[PDB]
Design a protein around this ligand. Structure first.
Ligand code: PNT
Lengths: 186, 186
């Protein structure tokens, strides 16, 4: 494909480099396509980027739904989601670029928007898990929205700022995290 | 001194223009030094920047030392340290140069080695708090190093990824997090 082949190349650079880093020049020279191409569906370069962010979040959320089945209690769904976060090839590998992207677009208002709409998906999984856990009586949270935001950010932190040491050590910490977090909910 | 003048000038340049655009040549002339002297003290821009980061960490340590007297118990020092981290990073001018530097060297090993000596210094704050907490029956944790790595990165995610919300909300969420987390340890 083409419209779907650019996405694929940019994704690679954005990760393999960063937002500021990788450039529309490089995107094109490693992919092969005129400039305008990136102008219809791809308004700006930050449009191509918010696009990739959309796919990835979709894909990771899809995979998680095709995987949460292995977890009976929501308590277990919480643990599972946090460990899978460490291994997916989706979304989380773009956190640095995103961090960077935000530190240079928070100055526009069209940014504090999309970058905040994508946040709804991001925290949704925890919302379902947490609200469902309330219905299922596993715990009793009155500020589900706050708790979901906190879990998602905390977890994205462990996933993102421990990205150097051994994966089993990480999975270990993440499980100890899920342990402590949930134990503090009640 | 000439060494400290290089550090001070570079720090300002990195803040005004960020990492990528700042050159050792700018640094040499503005501090009235030489490529040779700069080579002798730091070898490279990356190294120079890492040295700056260590000085910054010390300054941050010394500041924590004074501010933590506002907290009798370690339960308090925990709440206070997290809140501080969120508020001071909100207006820390080096954060962009730092974001630009990490997301651009978390691939190399030359650099990625030291970053961890540095990241470990930051995690120590938690280690001290938690150990002290044990010795005063505020809690009993048997995996101090571990809970410490977790608190550090979890807090870190909350500081880094919430960046699209009004400041009191973020402080509200950070404090809620400290409450939950400290609750799951008891
Ligand atoms: N001249 C001075 N007085 C001075 C100079 C530099 C300084 O350095 C501030 C660094 C601020 C950014 C603080 O960033 C974090 C992020 C996360 C955690 C955490 N997760 N614990 C802790 C700190 C402090 C004081």
């Amino acid at each position: 494909n083409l419209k779907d082949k650019i996405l694929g190349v940019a994704k690679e650079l954005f990760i393999k480099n960063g937002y500021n880093a990788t450039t529309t020049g490089e995107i094109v020279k490693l992919s092969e396509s005129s400039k305008g191409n990136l102008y219809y569906h791809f308004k700006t370069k930050e449009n191509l980027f918010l696009e990739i962010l959309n796919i990835e979040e979709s894909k990771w959320q899809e995979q998680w739904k095709k995987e949460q089945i292995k977890a009976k209690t929501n308590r277990e769904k919480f643990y599972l989601y946090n460990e899978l976060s460490l291994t997916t090839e989706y979304y989380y590998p773009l956190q640095n670029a995103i961090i960077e992207f935000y530190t240079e677009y928070y100055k526009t208002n069209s940014i504090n928007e999309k970058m905040n709409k994508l946040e709804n998906k991001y925290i949704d999984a925890y919302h379902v898990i947490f609200k469902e856990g309330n219905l299922n009586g596993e715990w009793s949270i009155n500020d589900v929205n706050a708790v979901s935001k906190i879990a998602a950010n905390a977890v994205n932190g462990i996933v993102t700022f421990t990205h150097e040491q051994n994966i089993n050590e990480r999975i270990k910490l993440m499980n100890k995290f899920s342990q402590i977090f949930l134990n503090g909910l009640s």
